[PDB]
Amino acid sequence: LSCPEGLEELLSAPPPDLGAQRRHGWNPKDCSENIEVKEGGLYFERRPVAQSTDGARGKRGYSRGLHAWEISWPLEQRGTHAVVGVATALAPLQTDHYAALLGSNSESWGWDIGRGKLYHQSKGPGAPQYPAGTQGEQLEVPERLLVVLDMEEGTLGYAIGGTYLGPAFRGLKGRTLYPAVSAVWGQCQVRIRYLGERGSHHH
Amino acid sequence: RGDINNN
């Protein structure tokens, strides 16, 4: 019942086709040097570079409306810091140590899918659990999760297993935000599947 | 390259 207006309808619609998936997928021209974007955007692979955290942005920045996408991140390919969220065009996408790079600054917001913590302007210590509460605490992030960006309310939230888990972050209005992840695992293959948009004020 | 994160 905390879902963005329009999300249920957006998710029930026929999914965007492979062309749309590529168009809204990872950007080969906007990722870490240590990442390769494959299949025209459908997934990326992080090369096995030591002492590096590496990010990617989607090709398309969202300034309005409701957008959603599915991230597929194999359970065995997460390593010590696997973070899923969004970033402005200004967020850094590489650093020379293993860390929750996405969410470590003012330009990025991330959920640590290993630890369950939220990062925005955070170096890690003290970061809050999401979703809050006992159900939320025991939640495991399976291979697939949905990322939901509501630019009318200015929220980012997530869904697993058919259930929206609530807004994770507020304070996103008046930005242009891109799908983003940060990864540390050699040879991880992280997929993005765009699920579409509802551009109108109430979606 | 053989480290904790498969590098």
Side-chain angles (χ1 to χ4, degrees), chain A residues 121-188:
Chain A
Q121 300 181 122
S122 176
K123 292 304 294 268
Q129 173 195 119
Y130 165 90
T134 60
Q135 185 66 28
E137 196 265 342
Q138 68 73 63
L139 181 65
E140 299 181 282
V141 181
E143 182 162 14
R144 290 175 293 278
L145 68 159
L146 302 193
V147 188
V148 180
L149 179 69
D150 177 347
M151 289 302 285
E152 302 299 304
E153 292 275 314
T155 64
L156 176 65
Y158 304 85
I160 291 166
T163 296
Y164 184 73
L165 300 174
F169 302 97
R170 312 187 73 76
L172 303 184
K173 297 176 190 188
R175 302 169 198 271
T176 299
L177 293 174
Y178 296 77
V181 294
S182 61
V184 295
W185 181 258
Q187 307 181 70
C188 62

Side-chain angles (χ1 to χ4, degrees), chain A residues 110-133:
Chain A
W111 186 32
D112 187 320
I113 62 172
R115 295 177 181 76
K117 294 178 176 330
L118 294 182
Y119 304 125
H120 174 59
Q121 300 181 122
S122 176
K123 292 304 294 268
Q129 173 195 119
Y130 165 90

Side-chain angles (χ1 to χ4, degrees), chain A:
Chain A
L1 299 179
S2 73
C3 288
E5 192 165 350
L7 181 58
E8 188 139 41
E9 190 276 317
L10 182 169
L11 295 179
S12 75
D17 69 10
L18 289 169
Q21 292 174 52
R22 286 190 178 103
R23 179 160 186 78
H24 289 259
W26 302 122
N27 191 166
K29 308 301 174 33
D30 197 13
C31 61
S32 174
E33 292 179 356
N34 307 315
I35 286 171
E36 59 185 340
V37 170
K38 296 277 201 68
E39 281 292 347
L42 303 177
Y43 73 100
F44 72 68
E45 184 161 339
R46 186 184 164 283
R47 237 145 318 119
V49 176
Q51 291 294 326
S52 183
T53 303
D54 298 278
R57 274 186 288 271
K59 293 171 175 97
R60 306 299 155 193
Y62 307 126
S63 301
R64 67 165 305 96
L66 177 64
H67 297 265
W69 55 94
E70 179 192 72
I71 293 290
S72 298
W73 195 327
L75 293 179
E76 78 286 356
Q77 296 176 9
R78 291 166 184 197
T80 59
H81 297 87
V83 186
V84 177
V86 293
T88 75
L90 299 181
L93 296 182
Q94 192 279 333
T95 187
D96 288 333
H97 61 109
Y98 297 133
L101 175 62
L102 193 74
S104 65
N105 51 55
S106 65
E107 298 306 312
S108 58
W109 293 260
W111 186 32
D112 187 320
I113 62 172
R115 295 177 181 76
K117 294 178 176 330
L118 294 182
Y119 304 125
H120 174 59
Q121 300 181 122
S122 176
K123 292 304 294 268
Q129 173 195 119
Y130 165 90
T134 60
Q135 185 66 28
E137 196 265 342
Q138 68 73 63
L139 181 65
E140 299 181 282
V141 181
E143 182 162 14
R144 290 175 293 278
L145 68 159
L146 302 193
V147 188
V148 180
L149 179 69
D150 177 347
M151 289 302 285
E152 302 299 304
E153 292 275 314
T155 64
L156 176 65
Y158 304 85
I160 291 166
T163 296
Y164 184 73
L165 300 174
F169 302 97
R170 312 187 73 76
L172 303 184
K173 297 176 190 188
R175 302 169 198 271
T176 299
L177 293 174
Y178 296 77
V181 294
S182 61
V184 295
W185 181 258
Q187 307 181 70
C188 62
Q189 296 178 321
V190 179
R191 309 185 58 84
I192 183 166
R193 182 167 72 93
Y194 188 58
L195 299 173
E197 82 163 40
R198 298 289 183 261
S200 61
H201 184 49
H202 290 118
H203 309 142

